[PDB]
Symmetry: C3
Subunit: 296 residues, 3 copies
Amino acid sequence: IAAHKGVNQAPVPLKMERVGPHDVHIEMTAQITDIEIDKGKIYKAWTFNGQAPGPLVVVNEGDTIHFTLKNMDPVVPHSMDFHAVHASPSKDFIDVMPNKSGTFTYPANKPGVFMYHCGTKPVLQHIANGMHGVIIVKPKNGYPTDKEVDREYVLIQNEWYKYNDMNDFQNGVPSYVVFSSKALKPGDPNTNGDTFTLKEKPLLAKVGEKIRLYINNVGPNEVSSFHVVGTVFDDVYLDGNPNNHLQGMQTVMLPASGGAVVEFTVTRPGTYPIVTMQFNHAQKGAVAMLKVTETG
Amino acid sequence: IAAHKGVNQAPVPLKMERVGPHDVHIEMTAQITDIEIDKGKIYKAWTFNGQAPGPLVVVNEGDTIHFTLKNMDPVVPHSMDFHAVHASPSKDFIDVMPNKSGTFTYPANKPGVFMYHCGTKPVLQHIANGMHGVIIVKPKNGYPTDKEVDREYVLIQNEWYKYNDMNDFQNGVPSYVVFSSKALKPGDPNTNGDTFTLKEKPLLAKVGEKIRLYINNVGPNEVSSFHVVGTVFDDVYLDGNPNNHLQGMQTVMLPASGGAVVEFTVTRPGTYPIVTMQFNHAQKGAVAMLKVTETG
Amino acid sequence: IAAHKGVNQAPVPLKMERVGPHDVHIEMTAQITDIEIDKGKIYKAWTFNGQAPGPLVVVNEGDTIHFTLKNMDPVVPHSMDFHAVHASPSKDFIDVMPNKSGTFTYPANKPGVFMYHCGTKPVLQHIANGMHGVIIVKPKNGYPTDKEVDREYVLIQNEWYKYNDMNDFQNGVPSYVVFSSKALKPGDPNTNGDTFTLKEKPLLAKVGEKIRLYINNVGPNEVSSFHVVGTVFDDVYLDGNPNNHLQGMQTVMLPASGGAVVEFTVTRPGTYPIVTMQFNHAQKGAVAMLKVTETG
Ligand SMILES: [Cu+2]
Ligand SMILES: [Cu+2]
Ligand SMILES: [Cu+2]
Ligand SMILES: [Cu+2]
Ligand SMILES: [Cu+2]
Ligand SMILES: [Cu+2]
Ligand SMILES: [Cu+2]
Ligand SMILES: [Cu+2]
Ligand SMILES: [Cu+2]
Ligand SMILES: [Cu+2]
Ligand SMILES: [Cu+2]
Ligand SMILES: [Cu+2]
Ligand SMILES: [Cu+2]
Ligand SMILES: [Cu+2]
Ligand SMILES: [Cu+2]
Ligand SMILES: [Cu+2]
Ligand SMILES: [Cu+2]
Ligand SMILES: [Cu+2]
Ligand SMILES: [Cu+2]
């Protein structure tokens, strides 16, 4: 796209603020931003806010979201579909033109770990170029295992293809499959989908801890066989709904867009890989690390 | 196949009749029928009854099915495997020769949303050429959410490959992935697996309704990441068995042949896409539409 | 690998012995062994104990495993990752050099049907060349349906690719997808992942029996849509954990490394195929047979 040549729009922070006990404002951008997805490999991503996957959104069950998209792309329209919400797609997930904004309002009434993504045709093009992310909706009544959890992180799986190549997006294997982590609390890492960051800068934990991961596989095209090496998931909540409780899972199958809350205990000091057990994907980048120390 | 050149056997209606409180007769054909799977693209499908996927069968839990297959194909044997039934495959899912009939009897004792397909070697060839469908077995005791459901439809996902090409069937990506709808009540649409019909003629519903979909992914080869845009599944029954209850799912993973009953609320007027979130497949056809109006 | 040319190391029996009420010794080898994966096709597999998948391990919930790997490969290091165990991967799933041994100790505290595999980088290479298997951990309190089960077997699904070809392992479709059976009791078959053995020598059962299968899809790369033709699964325990109970499933979705305990009734004499309903994989080998007779 001629109008994207040389474009590298600096990341813009997510803006959120609570405007009522059950109402929250969110403002995101659509923007074109260079991201290093593998060493020496820059992808001029289509993004929310200059991150791919996009920034983490966290709301409470029952919150109505008043969402603004400011489209900084100079030529391509963009839009937003939150899987968390009840909305009219043809009214509320509509396009925002270049250099314009749009505001849409809709409720998040279901707890869980939801994908969000651009909804502009061809949606495959917009998702594969980077316009995906996660919104967490916290359950009013928590999870039954909340009191056991010592530490928590968010991990997202996505693919990368040949650059803006619709034939490859439709018909080709992914060139890379990657993990990223998005911060929940101050000091947590906040990273983009790449083959290396969570190897070189592992997530951190302490011996004996029960860890919760909020996870989503945003695809666009693949499923995930999510596994933490050296442990077993004590508890799994499919899509992060507390009712969808499984126990003692080795591996959690995630559809494209699928989420989960998974919890597991790290019993011994060391480094614990986090993989998809679809090992062709792990070989192509989808391995993160958890470093477990006596202190944390 | 020389004997299929120029063959286009007109669709023949499914025949069913109840013959006892727990016994039902079903008569289907195997026949060779041209189907427009994408605009301008005719596939000379191997079918049950001239539809691909085949006609919908609905029975009650505990019904014994007395099934007749009349093979109209001039050269290829065909057969029937119902996933709903307990049967001896080597006696009861056997081949029927060209221009012959065969009758087989077997019980449907499990509620749910089952695949059916031809069982003739190579089974991949017979399924990929179009010989797939759904049989619904209604639970004796219903589902716990029956009283909440306002409206219901059946949707089926399938792939199409290069025509009768066993190399492609085994080794290639699908050329198209598609939805079809099969009628449960008078006036419901009844369509074949194609890239366009359920876009151009959306399923219909009314604002505020709880919708039930009976769904199955018949493959042959792919899994599905089933999602209704702009809603969340309130309740999901895996394979349509009432016991396999999930709540608040964004996306339902379906194996090849996998079924589900999914229920969701449409809160606002508009058009709601129905997708697999494996967006390479959605791009290749697997998007249906649900049009939600103030009246229905 | 020059040092593997002409190498065919005869299979060595698994060694296990109980050393305390909650402690078990296991000794395995890593070795290079020719396996006929399809008629006329020899794969010089990287194996545990000369089998691919490797030998079956069965322990009790709460058993600590004192595991020794004796590496007979003349040049490549190997290692062991049991999905059953809590361990420090960077201390306990480490490499054993050629012609050396290593001993590692770790608890199996979770019931279920777990993958095991080599953990040596590139792990895809080691798994795809054959270093995969299953460990069953028997639940202390059994399964709720134990008293209904008449007969049980273990089945494992795996893929085979072009020989030691990392490009194909990462980017290619499987050349073969296969089932194998591993013995639980004397007289049970014990076979390797190949396209033919369980067709030519079916598993055996008697009319009317409830059959339990302990199943795992070891991949490396594909998911499985596991189905027994002519029946429905009465009960399914995901990953073999008794809590993860489903009923009346036609088809069980297994992620890569995913396990299950599945139970089903065979009502009539005959031969019952066992498939993945991803029929491209079934066409490429993934069909086993169950022969059901009046006697067994
Ligand atoms: Cu309030
Ligand atoms: Cu507002
Ligand atoms: Cu966009
Ligand atoms: Cu892939
Ligand atoms: Cu703790
Ligand atoms: Cu799956
Ligand atoms: Cu693993
Ligand atoms: Cu009766
Ligand atoms: Cu009759
Ligand atoms: Cu047929
Ligand atoms: Cu595909
Ligand atoms: Cu209603
Ligand atoms: Cu979506
Ligand atoms: Cu004891
Ligand atoms: Cu010892
Ligand atoms: Cu190895
Ligand atoms: Cu495949
Ligand atoms: Cu019995
Ligand atoms: Cu089938």
